[PDB]
Amino acid sequence: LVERWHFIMLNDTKRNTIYNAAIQKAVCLGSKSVLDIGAGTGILSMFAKKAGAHSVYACELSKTMYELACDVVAANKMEAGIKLLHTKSLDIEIPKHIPERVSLVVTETVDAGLFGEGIVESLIHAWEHLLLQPKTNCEKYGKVIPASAVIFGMAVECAEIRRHHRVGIKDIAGIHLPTNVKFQSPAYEPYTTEKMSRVPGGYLALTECFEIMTVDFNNLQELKSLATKKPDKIGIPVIKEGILDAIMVWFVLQLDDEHSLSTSPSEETCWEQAVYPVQDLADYWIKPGDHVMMEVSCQDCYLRIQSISVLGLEQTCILESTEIALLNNIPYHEGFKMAMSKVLSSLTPEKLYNILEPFYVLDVSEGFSVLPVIAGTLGQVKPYSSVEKDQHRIALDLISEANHFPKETLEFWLRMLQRPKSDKLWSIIILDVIEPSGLIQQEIMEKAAISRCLLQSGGKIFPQYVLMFGLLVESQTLLEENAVQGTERTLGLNIAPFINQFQVPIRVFLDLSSLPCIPLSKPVELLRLDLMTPYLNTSNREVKVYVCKSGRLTAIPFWYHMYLDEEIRLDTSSEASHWKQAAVVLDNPIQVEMGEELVLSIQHHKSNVSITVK
Template sequence: MEEAARDYLTYARQLSTNGCYSKAFDLYILAFDKNPQLKNLFEPEFQIVLMRLNDILAAAGKIEDIFTNFGRAIKTFPDNIYLLNEIGKYLYKFGYYTEAWCHFQKALKTDSGFVNAEKNLNSVKNLLVERWHFRMLNDKIRNEAYRAAIHATITPIKDSVIDVGTGTGLLALYAYERKPMVITACDGSEVMTKVAEGITQDMGINDMIILNKMSTSMNYKDIGGKRSLLITEMFDAGLFGEHILQTLSHAWEYLLSNTGRVVPNKAEFFIAAANCNHLHLKYQLGDNAKALLNIPMVNVHILTYDETYDCEDVHLFKDIKYITEPQSLIKVDFNDYDDIQDKLYRCEPFSVEFNALEDGEINTMIGWFKLYLTENITITTDPRADNRCNAWQQAVFFDNIPKKVNKNETIISQFLMNSGKLTMLPDCNSDIMRISPETLRFLNDSDYMKMITGCIGMACVYLGQMIDMSEMSIVDLCPFPVFGMHMLKRGAQSLVCYAKTYSDEEFIIRVFKDNNIDLSKVNVLVGDDWTQDTFTDEKYHAIFCNTFELCGEIDLRQKDIAQHLKNAHLLQGGLFMPSNITIMCQLVDCHWLDINNRVYDENVSNYKVGAYLNKYQVSQNFCIDLSHLEYTPITEPTSLGSYTSGIRSEVVNIPIINNGDANAILCWYKIELMEDLGDISTNRSNSFIDNLAFLANPKIHMTSGEVANVLRCVDPDGAFKLMIDVESA
């Protein structure tokens, strides 16, 4: 029997080599059935065959066959965490989110240090419940204002209520407190509908109707008659971006009685012209970068991806200066159907006129709103107000050309209601080039650009010892090849570089032309439709790679390519950059991270919301600018070792400097481009990448003078996460 099993394995390997993965898979299973003792030895190669087979089946749309194979594989290897994770990934891909969650969680119960399973579980949670739900529910100012307004509006026993976009059902619960005749709540999210049902049922409320439907897909027959009051909180930073005008237009036609009312009664949107270098550099190429590239007069903006504004917590930007007073752009009466129609279908732009308070430059427009919940109860998202609601961020209209103004000068800006969403009209006819966020942020990182350009002379001296500049071949896979461009300008023979998008490729070509670079020397790799095989057998004298994602994560694909280039394509004695990347961390107590990941019942009038929503807490946050984050340090910043030289899972001991409850491990990197030339931290303002936070749940009390134990978990592919080791904490 053992000999037969060995024969099966030999044949399976032959079939696999020839790409016959289906037959090879069957023979591996037969071999393991014949001789179970072979399973541990041949498990890794069996997994590879299964993954390749499923890739082929997925391309052919044979979903049932994929899960049949997984079923047979997991029966053979019931505790294989990698198989559980792969099953979860396919379930996620095909929309079976609850089942995917179960598989990722099962893998983590077997190995809590399994990084990829945890990241995948976080992805499921983020998809099912968007993060803004947490900050909105923790906004006590907003919640209590809505509660007071709803109480003041409802006539007990007489009113019939519909809560549109109910979410957890909080506003419907406030309405229920006033004992109206009937309450219907609806939401398009199945998850949020189930959360609302769970909360109300636990309270013994059985006469509230909760529907998993968009209000715009219903009429009064679907809800048992027209309603006398509609309550809603369907607003984004730009007020209208959640299609509130379309929703209310439909509601007045199909869901509300002629004498119905809406809470909020009215809304008003304000605009202020401002100067903020940090915001400007997030969306447009700055003067320093233009000077570096020798394109001083070219307007270069971020790719918009059809977004007309971005959302930011503007009060965190300490360098913001308001050049004008805010002006009212639009005021809409939600209780007036004609006014809603007028605003929604208006073709003419809304104009706003400003007077400059001082000499300066306007490089951004900030928008916020005021909700008139009733005549006497209002809330605002004004970033200058101490009593603002933090449930919503502010709208940043980022696509205007910076404009110099003099004190008392009049400035006119125009906005369109574009499909129910505000769009700022361009104030001039200037041509604008578009590049990816990655490329723009990279070039606008002045400190990193100085470090790159500052090491070019040393690189030339080092490489000049092995070959003449005219024969030098370079690879620069950074978002923009600053190093490679300067080497070409010094006479290098060739450059292979990378463009994330075709817009980036156009930009690279334009800059190279403006710098009189011979494009025949340049090969641009665009997008992700290339692999390490693209480099065939070529050898290079200098290789500069970027292994970071914009959000702060390690880009595992680029990491693998970088490692391959270093090992297989770098000439002996050649230069590889960066020479070292160090992972840094710091344990902190951060309120902002807390309220964006956990609902506190005291903030929602002591309704038991947390028990239902907090199961969707995640263990990691991305895209964090630590220079704007308020927190109390529990430890000093600490090195967790070199990522470049390879890291393994281990516990790192860190001295505690302050008493407190640690709820996060902040994480960033130090980058050393060349040995002994110093390093640069990504934990600073205007860094080309954001930072990470690994979240502790629950908080862990720390005592000054003791030691915190941070567990650094690393998967075989290099993905890592950080955890506070609770057992030894």
């Protein structure tokens, strides 16, 4: 309900201090009438009032955030001086919502790409309807904090970004990906966002930092012009050999002459960068002498970088990032090849590489999957794909052709779980068990139980079972993302007890490998989800975890080993995993001692798992 950024930004003392100092300066120079656009909990509005502003107006788009801001403003005894408005800034009218035009607008409607929260649209409206005229004293003319911003770019090598946007291989577990199928991510999604200061495997600067654009938030003509301004065509010198994976983008906010904020990548700051993946080139290798060329525009809200190309000295298949990461997950496909060949082998080795009767193999993977083609290559197999999108069907037809399938070897199941034919049964059913989120898929136990009945004698659900592993960690990061840590970070203002009512018990879409934390235990098996034998499912159980190290336990990250058979397991935490992980974050951190035996109480019901300290 409450975006994680509200917790991180409220816990950033440095940022609170700098916004307070800028709002203080402006108010005491006589900006005593303030509109806070995107107020969240209302901390900037409370800075303005306490700085001596006469009237403060705070608008917030989210019902949840507006109600929270009402509660926080009241709790800090500022109900009377601060008018909270449940409204998009665009829908503020004078005198209906605000009595008079205001001397100061403060806005934190800002994303990693600066523009992605509609600031340009808001400030154009603000200048036109809501602000006093600009300077041609301070009580008599309109001004905006932030005043202006410089946007910076850098060409980078980053395999972690690459593996989500480009398919890196021509051959997966003995199937050929044909040249005549081009895979593109959806960023070909104007950008992704990334804490680049700790992206798994890091990044390499291939160019110097280069200025992309400047913006003056106090110049209405300039903001009005962005909409129709001709894209800047630019060309950036290469200073290092490497693979061109992305343009990394950040910015400096000038709040006023003396106060600025940088979203430059750093472990010292909370800020993320905008990331523009590079794809649909013949070659990605760049070296000193080359230029990185691109068009930069800001016409329809977002900063777009397009036509990214390298100046030196054919069916398209759109995949989600998860599906691109999947095709780049080699051990996943090699596991399936091996484990499928073993199940085929132990049921009819004669049909592995009644003659007319194949192995029937059903793939119920959620999205795009090449498992059926891999199954196809193993023996006399009739493989079934569960792809819905026409584009996926065409790609798989073309991949089939490239691996010497006769036409209509690969069948499409959608074009309910049922028998393959009237009096026939499945040799393998593949179920999708774990969400990209790192949570167990809903209704999986139902799908398993239905699927069990539809199997040939000695046939298998893949995976047969799944072990969930956990780790005791001390993570201040996970804590500061989860909960405001008291009053001192918000400069005495009392916000934590109100926002912390919206603590999430579980952080999903977590990159474990990147996480700054201290391990307090070794991995430990937390529960078994067994698709072949439901009786082995952990109902409710306690787990004794040996504490290897003294620390403040804040979280229990968790991932899965998915067993295709007893020898072959997939790791959702693997380097190349197309799954994210998750973590239980404690409402209250617990202190643990080396030698202690901590008890986790683990409640499991369907696809939901409670994990608690006892």
